[PDB]
Short mmCIF file of C-alpha atoms and ligand atoms in Angstrom, two decimals:
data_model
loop_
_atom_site.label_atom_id
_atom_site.label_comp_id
_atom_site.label_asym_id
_atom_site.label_seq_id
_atom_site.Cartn_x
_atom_site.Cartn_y
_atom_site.Cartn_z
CA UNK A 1 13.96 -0.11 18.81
CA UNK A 2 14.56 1.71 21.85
CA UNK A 3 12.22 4.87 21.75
CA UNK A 4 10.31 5.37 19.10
CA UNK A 5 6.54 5.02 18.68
CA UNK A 6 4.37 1.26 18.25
CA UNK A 7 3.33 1.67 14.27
CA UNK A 8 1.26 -0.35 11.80
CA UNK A 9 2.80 -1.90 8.06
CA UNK A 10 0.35 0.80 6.53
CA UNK A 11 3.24 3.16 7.65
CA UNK A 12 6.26 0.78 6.57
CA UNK A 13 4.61 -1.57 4.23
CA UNK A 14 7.81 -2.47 2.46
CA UNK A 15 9.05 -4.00 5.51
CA UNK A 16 9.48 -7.44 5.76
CA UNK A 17 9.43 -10.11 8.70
CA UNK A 18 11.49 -12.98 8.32
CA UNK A 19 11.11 -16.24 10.66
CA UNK A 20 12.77 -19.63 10.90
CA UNK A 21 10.91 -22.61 11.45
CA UNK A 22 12.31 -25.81 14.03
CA UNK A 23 9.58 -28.53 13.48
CA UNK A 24 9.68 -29.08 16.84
CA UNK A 25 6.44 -27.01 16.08
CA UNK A 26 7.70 -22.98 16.65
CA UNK A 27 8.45 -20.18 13.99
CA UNK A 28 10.74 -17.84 15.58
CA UNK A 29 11.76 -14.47 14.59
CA UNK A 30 14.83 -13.54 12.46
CA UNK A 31 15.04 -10.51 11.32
CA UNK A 32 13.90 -7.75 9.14
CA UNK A 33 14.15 -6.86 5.54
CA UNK A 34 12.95 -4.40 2.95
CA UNK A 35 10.47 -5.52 -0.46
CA UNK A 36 13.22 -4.21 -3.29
CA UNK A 37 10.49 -5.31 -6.15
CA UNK A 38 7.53 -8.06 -6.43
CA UNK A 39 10.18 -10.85 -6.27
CA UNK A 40 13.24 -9.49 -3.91
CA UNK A 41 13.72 -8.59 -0.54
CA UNK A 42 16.65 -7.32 1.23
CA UNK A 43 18.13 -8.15 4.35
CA UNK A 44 21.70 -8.37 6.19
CA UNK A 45 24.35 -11.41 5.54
CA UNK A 46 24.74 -12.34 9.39
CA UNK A 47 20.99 -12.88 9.66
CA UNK A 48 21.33 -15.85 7.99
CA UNK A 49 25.57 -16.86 8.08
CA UNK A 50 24.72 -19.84 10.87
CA UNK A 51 22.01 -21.10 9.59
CA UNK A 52 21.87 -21.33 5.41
CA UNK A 53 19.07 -23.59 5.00
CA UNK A 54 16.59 -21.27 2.98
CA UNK A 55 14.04 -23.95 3.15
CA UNK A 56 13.62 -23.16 6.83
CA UNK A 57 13.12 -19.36 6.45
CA UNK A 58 9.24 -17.86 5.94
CA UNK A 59 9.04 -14.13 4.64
CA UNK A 60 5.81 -12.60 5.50
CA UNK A 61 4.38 -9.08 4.27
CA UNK A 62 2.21 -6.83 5.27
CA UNK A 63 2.47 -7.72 9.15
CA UNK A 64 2.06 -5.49 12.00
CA UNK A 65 2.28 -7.87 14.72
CA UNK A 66 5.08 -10.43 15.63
CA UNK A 67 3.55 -13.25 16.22
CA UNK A 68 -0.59 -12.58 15.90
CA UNK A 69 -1.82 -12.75 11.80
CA UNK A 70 -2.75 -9.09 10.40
CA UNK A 71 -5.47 -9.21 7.83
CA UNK A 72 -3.88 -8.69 4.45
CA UNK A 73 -0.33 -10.59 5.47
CA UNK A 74 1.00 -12.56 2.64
CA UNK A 75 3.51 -15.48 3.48
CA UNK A 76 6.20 -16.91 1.38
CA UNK A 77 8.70 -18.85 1.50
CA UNK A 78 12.78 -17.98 0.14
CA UNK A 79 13.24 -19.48 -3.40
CA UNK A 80 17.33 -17.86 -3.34
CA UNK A 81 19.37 -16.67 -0.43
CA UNK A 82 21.79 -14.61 -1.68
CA UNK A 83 24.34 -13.66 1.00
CA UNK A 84 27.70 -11.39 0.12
CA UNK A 85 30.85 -13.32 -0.87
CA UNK A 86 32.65 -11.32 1.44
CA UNK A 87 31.08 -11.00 4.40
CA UNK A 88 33.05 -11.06 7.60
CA UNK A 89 32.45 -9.99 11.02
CA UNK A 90 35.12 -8.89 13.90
CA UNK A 91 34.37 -7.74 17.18
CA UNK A 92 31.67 -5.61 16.11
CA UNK A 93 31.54 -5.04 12.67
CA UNK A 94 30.09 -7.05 9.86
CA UNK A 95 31.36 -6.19 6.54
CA UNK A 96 29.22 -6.67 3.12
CA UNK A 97 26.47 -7.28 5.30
CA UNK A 98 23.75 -7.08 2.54
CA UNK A 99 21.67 -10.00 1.48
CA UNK A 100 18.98 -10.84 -1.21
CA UNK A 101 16.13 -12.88 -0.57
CA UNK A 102 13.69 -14.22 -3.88
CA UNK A 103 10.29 -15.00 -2.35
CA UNK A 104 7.79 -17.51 -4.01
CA UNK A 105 4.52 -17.53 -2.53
CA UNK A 106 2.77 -21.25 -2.51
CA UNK A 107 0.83 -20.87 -5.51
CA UNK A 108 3.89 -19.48 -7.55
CA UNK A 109 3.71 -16.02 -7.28
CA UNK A 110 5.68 -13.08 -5.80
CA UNK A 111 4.36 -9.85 -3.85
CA UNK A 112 1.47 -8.53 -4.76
CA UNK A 113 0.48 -4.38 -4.04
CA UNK A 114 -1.75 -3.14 -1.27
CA UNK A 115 -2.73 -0.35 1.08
CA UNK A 116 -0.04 -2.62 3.50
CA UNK A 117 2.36 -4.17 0.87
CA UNK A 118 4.84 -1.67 -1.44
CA UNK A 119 8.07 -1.52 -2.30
CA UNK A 120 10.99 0.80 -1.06
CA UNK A 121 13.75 2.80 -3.48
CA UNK A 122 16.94 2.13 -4.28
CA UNK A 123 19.24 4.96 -4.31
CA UNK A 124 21.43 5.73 -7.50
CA UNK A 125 25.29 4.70 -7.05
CA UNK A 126 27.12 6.53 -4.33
CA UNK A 127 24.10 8.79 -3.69
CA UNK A 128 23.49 9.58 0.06
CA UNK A 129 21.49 12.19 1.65
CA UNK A 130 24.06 14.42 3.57
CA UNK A 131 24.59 14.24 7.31
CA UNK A 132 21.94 15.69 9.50
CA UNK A 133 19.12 14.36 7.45
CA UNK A 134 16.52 12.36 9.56
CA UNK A 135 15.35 9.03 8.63
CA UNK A 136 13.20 6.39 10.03
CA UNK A 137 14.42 2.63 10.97
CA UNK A 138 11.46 0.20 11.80
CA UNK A 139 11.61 -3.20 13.26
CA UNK A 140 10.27 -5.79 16.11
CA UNK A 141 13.68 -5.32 17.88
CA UNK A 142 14.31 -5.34 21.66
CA UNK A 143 12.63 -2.24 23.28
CA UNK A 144 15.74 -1.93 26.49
CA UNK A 145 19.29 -3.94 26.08
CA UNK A 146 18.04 -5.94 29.12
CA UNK A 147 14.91 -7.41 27.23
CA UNK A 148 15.24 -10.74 26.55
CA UNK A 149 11.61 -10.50 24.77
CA UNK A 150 10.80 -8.87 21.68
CA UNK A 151 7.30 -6.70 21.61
CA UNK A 152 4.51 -7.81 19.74
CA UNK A 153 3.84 -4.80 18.24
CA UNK A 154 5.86 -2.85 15.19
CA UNK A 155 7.20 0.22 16.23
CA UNK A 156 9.19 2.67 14.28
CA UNK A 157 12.05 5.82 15.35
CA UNK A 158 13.57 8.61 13.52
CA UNK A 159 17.48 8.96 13.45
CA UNK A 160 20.07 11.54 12.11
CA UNK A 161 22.81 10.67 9.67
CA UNK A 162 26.01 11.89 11.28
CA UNK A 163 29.36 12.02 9.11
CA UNK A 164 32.10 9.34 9.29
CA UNK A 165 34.61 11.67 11.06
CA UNK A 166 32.19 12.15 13.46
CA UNK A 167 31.43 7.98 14.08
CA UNK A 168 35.14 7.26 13.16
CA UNK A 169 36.21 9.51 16.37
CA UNK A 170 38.39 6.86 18.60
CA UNK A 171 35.39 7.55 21.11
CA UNK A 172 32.98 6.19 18.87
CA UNK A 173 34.04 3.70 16.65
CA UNK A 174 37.50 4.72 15.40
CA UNK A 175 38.27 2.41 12.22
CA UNK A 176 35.64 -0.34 12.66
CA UNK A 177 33.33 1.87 10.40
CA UNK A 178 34.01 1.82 6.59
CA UNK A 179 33.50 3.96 3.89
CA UNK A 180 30.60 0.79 3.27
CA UNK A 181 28.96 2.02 6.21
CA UNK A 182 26.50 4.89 7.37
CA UNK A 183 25.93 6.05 11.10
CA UNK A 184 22.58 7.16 12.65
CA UNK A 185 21.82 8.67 16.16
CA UNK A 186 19.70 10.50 18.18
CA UNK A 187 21.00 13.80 19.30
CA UNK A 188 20.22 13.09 22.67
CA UNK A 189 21.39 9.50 22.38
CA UNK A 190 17.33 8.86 23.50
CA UNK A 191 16.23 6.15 20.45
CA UNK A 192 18.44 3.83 18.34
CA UNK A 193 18.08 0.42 16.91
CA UNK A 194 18.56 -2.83 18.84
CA UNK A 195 19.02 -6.94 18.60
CA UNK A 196 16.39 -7.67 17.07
CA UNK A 197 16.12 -4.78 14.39
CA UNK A 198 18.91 -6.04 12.22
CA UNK A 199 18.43 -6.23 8.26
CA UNK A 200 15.39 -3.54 8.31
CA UNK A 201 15.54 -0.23 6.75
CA UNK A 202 17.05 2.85 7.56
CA UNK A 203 14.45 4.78 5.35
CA UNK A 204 15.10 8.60 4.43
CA UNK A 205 14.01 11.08 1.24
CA UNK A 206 16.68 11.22 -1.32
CA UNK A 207 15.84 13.35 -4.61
CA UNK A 208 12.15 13.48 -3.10
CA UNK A 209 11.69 9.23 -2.85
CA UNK A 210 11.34 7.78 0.09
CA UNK A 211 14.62 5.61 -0.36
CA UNK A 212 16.09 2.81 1.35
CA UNK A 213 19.81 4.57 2.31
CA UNK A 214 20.51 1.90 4.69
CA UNK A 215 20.15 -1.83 6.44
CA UNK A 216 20.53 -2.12 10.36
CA UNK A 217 24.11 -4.00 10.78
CA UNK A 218 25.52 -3.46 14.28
CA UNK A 219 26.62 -1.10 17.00
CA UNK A 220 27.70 -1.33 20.76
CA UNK A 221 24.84 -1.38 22.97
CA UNK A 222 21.65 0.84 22.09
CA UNK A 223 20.92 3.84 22.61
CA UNK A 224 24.40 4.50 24.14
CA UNK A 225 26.41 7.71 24.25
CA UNK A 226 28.64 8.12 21.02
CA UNK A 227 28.05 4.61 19.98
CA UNK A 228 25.51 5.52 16.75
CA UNK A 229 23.56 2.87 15.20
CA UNK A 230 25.77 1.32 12.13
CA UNK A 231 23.92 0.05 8.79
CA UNK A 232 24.93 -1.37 5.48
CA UNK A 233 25.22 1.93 3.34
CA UNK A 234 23.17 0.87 0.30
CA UNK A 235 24.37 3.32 -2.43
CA UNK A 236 27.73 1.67 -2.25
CA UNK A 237 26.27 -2.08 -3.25
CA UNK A 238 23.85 -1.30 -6.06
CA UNK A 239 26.08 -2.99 -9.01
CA UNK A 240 26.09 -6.24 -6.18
CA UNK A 241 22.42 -5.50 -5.92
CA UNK A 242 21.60 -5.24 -9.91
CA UNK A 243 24.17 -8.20 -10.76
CA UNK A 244 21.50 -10.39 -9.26
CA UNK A 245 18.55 -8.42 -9.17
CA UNK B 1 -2.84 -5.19 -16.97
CA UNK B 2 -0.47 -6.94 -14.17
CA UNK B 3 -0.83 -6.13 -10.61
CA UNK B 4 3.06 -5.76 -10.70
CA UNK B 5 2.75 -2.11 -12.59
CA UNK B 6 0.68 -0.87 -9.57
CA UNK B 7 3.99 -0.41 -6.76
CA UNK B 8 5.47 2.80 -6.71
CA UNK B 9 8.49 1.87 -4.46
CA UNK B 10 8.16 4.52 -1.63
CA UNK B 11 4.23 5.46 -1.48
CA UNK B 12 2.26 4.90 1.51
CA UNK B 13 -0.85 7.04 0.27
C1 133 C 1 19.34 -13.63 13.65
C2 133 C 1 20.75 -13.96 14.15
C3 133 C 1 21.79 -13.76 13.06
C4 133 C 1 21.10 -13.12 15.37
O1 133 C 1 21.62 -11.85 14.97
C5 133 C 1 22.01 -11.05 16.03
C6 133 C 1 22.55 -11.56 17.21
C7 133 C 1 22.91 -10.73 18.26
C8 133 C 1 22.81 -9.37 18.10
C9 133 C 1 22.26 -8.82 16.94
C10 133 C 1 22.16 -7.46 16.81
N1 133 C 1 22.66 -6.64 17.72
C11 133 C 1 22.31 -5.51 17.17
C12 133 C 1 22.58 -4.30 17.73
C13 133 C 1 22.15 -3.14 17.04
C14 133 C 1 22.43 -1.88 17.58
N2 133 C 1 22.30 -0.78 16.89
N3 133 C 1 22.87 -1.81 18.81
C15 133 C 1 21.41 -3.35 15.83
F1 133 C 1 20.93 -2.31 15.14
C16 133 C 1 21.15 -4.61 15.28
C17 133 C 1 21.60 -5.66 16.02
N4 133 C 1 21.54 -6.92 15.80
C18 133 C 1 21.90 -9.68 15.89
O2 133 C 1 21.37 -9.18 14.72
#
């Protein structure tokens, strides 16, 4: 996230961390996801595309820090990967870019709740909040384009929905954003989402819950001029969602 | 009764 403030789970704790393991001995960083319910956890396709071995994949809760244990972390460990039949990615976009993750901890059991670990809301079919509205993306994503490093520490932004004519201009985006899409920005094009941040939540309040509208997907750069942030838009994938949640 | 019951999806506090 470029921008934003550093943040604690207690102020995101549906978010998820997801890691890959290389026995050569490190874990390394994936992406991030959203806790849907007790068992489920949402993510985007491309975070996983190259590399579909869900045995190598650890999903920890309840983390604040990247690579340092919080107190209260759970771990588990991906019992389905569900990626979109679909999916497909051009030079830019990523289509259907959802994906479902079942977690099973080691003794058998899925999420548990506490003050760090709760889950997020699904919005009804095709409901949105209307441009303008300002919601919150969190994730361990690169803080400047030119980081090569990801921080340590959680850190959190808020965004505006802007309108699809208004991303769909030729100087934005033009085409490469769907109607299965949803575009964020700053005013000031100060704070966006970066590498790193993909598959974590674009959070805003929707019938007064807190609901997950959209997933971090792609954009050109961050935190450029008229190229807004572009995530998976949510409302339009809840029958994929249900059929296998 | 089951821990499960006690998430409300979307509260912090
Ligand atoms: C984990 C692997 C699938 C690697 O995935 C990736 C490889 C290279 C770039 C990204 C990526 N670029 C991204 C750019 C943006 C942005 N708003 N500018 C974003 F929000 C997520 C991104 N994710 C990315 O998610």
């Amino acid at each position: 996230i470029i921008g934003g403030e550093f943040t604690t789970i207690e102020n995101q704790p549906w978010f998820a961390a997801i890691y890959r393991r290389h026995r050569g001995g490190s874990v390394t960083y994936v992406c991030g996801g959203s806790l849907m319910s007790p068992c489920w956890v949402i993510s985007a396709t491309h975070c996983f595309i190259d590399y579909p071995k869900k045995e190598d994949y650890i999903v920890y809760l309840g983390r604040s820090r990247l690579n340092s244990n919080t107190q209260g972390e759970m771990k588990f460990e991906v019992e389905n990967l569900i990626l979109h039949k679909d999916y497909s990615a051009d030079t830019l976009a990523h289509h259907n870019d959802i994906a479902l993750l079942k977690i099973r901890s080691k003794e058998g059991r899925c999420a548990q709740p506490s003050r760090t670990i709760q889950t997020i809301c699904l919005p009804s079919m095709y409901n949105d909040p209307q441009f303008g509205t300002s919601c919150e993306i969190t994730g361990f994503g690169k803080e400047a384009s030119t980081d090569y490093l990801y921080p340590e520490q959680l850190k959190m932004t808020v965004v505006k929905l802007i309108s699809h004519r208004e991303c769909q201009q030729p100087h934005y985006y033009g085409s490469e954003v769907t109607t299965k899409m949803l575009c964020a920005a700053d005013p000031q094009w100060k704070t966006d989402s970066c590498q790193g941040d993909s598959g974590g939540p674009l959070v805003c309040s929707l019938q007064g819950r807190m609901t997950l509208t959209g997933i971090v997907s792609w954009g050109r750069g961050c935190a450029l001029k008229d190229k807004p942030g572009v995530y998976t838009r949510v409302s339009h994938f809840l029958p994929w969602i249900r059929s296998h949640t | 009764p089951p821990e499960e019951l006690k998430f409300q999806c979307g509260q912090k506090t």
